[PDB]
Design a protein around this ligand. Structure first.
Ligand SMILES: Nc1ncnc2c1ncn2[C@@H]1O[C@H](COP(=O)(O)OP(=O)(O)OP(=O)(O)O)[C@@H](O)[C@H]1O
Ligand SMILES: C/C1=C/C(=O)O[C@@H]2C[C@@H](CC[C@H](C)/C=C\CC1)O[C@@](O)([C@@H]1CSC(=O)N1)C2
Ligand SMILES: [Mg+2]
Lengths: 360, 30
């Protein structure tokens, strides 16, 4: 792997980084810089006393100095590569400002001296990971959720929906509701515990009102979770109330439509003659789409909104937590893509704005 | 993951130009 192209998917929560042609990212680490509450600690150095900063908020880079620290860490600490040896594919959020795209390009070529690079939209890569070039992606990670309709690789910006509700908000909501049975989780470390509970025990009910009316009865619903220190907590309806928030954002006092509604609204902003192709190709990607039941719930909800004749297919791969990265690995490994890299020579001649003409 | 990259390569190789999507009203002019 001395010169294998690199693929880096910079999330609000996790960096996923690795080598093109691999089936999974070699390195997955938190997108944080930590400082004493030695001057700074990046990624897992910080996770291991410190106040944390996330340089990407809701998928958009908002702290460039710390982002540069994150990229440095990715190359020198995590992947341990000389960046000059590797074409590098980066990812970006849908609707990323042009200035941001340019700055990422400038940093990669001028600061890290990469020989070639490219920037692709995260949702487009997830779509490609499924083998498709047309469809509508629900991409939901730690910091942001989007519905992104894509036709032949082009995201359709007028139809893109952004919702700030994503995994971090769901953790915070689970912390709040766990206060009802009386379990207090408060600190940054305790928030991580509740993230883990969310990931291990939460699920999306097919029929929420019925699941509530039932919980109240049964139970295989109640589940126990053992804390690091050996004590146990038990959770019941919180298991499915937490991610229900994706369908009912009013649970956290947000006025937004839920993700089934936003998917439908996004499809309805697209030309009518491509809608059938969108419905038949709804891809889910990102960690917050990992809840058991969420694909069946979306299928039910979209079916209820869509024309009754419409073929609806939700594609929710088991690796979807990494589908963006995987689609980058696949794309950067294709013969077809090699002509598409921005080369250092091209950058020298055209400057950072070359990204707009080459990455689309 | 897709069972093959074969159709993906063929789709990329025959990808329409942006101007065509605009003419078709799939994309807005920009
Ligand atoms: N099994 C799971 N069930 C539910 N949520 C999960 C699961 N695994 C991970 N998550 C959540 O997904 C989030 C991380 O996902 P991901 O890496 O896709 O986000 P990101 O790319 O860093 O963020 P974004 O794309 O929003 O900028 C966290 O909130 C994490 O708790
Ligand atoms: C295992 C893991 C998962 C994750 O998604 O981590 C990311 C990044 C992380 C950074 C702080 C944490 C202390 C460091 C590492 C945990 C990384 O913040 C998150 O856990 C935030 C806070 S709680 C939540 O759901 N998202 C998401
Ligand atoms: Mg992401």
């Amino acid at each position: 792997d001395e010169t294998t192209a690199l693929v880096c998917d910079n999330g609000s929560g996790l960096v996923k980084a690795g080598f093109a042609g691999d089936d999974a990212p070699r390195a997955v680490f938190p997108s944080i810089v930590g400082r004493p509450r030695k001057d700074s600690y990046v990624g897992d150095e910080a996770q291991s006393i410190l106040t944390l900063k996330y340089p990407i908020e809701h998928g958009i880079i908002t702290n460039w100095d710390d982002m540069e620290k994150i990229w440095h860490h990715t190359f020198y600490n995590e992947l341990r590569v000389a960046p000059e040896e590797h074409p590098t594919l980066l990812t970006e959020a849908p609707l990323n400002p042009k200035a941001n795209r340019e700055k990422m390009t400038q940093i990669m070529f001028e600061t890290f001296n990469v020989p070639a690079m490219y920037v692709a939209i995260q949702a487009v890569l997830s779509l490609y990971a499924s083998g498709r070039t047309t469809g509508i992606v629900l991409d939901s990670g730690d910091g942001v959720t989007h519905n992104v309709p894509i036709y032949e690789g082009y995201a359709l910006p007028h139809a893109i929906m952004r919702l700030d509700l994503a995994g971090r908000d769901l953790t915070d909501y689970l912390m709040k509701i766990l206060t009802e049975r009386g379990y207090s989780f408060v600190t940054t470390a305790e928030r991580e515990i509740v993230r883990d509970i969310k990931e291990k025990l939460c699920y999306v009910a097919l029929d929420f009102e019925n699941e509530m009316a039932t919980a109240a009865s049964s139970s295989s619903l109640e589940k126990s979770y053992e804390l690091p220190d050996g004590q146990v907590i038990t959770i019941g309806n919180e298991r499915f109330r937490c991610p229900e928030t994706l369908f009912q954002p009013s649970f956290i006092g947000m006025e937004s439509a839920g993700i089934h509604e936003t998917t439908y609204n996004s499809i309805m902003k697209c030309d009518i003659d491509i809608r059938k192709d969108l419905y038949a190709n709804n891809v889910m990607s990102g960690g917050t789409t990992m809840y058991p039941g969420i694909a069946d719930r979306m299928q039910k909800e979209i079916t209820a909104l869509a024309p009754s004749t419409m073929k609806i297919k939700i594609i929710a791969p088991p690796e979807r937590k990494y589908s963006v990265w995987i689609g980058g690995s696949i794309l950067a490994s294709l013969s077809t893509f090699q002509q598409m890299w921005i080369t250092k020579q091209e950058y020298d001649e055209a400057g950072p704005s070359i990204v707009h003409r080459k990455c689309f | 993951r897709a069972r093959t990259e074969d159709y993906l390569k063929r789709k990329i190789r025959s990808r329409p130009e942006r101007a065509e999507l605009v003419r078709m009203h799939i994309l807005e002019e920009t």
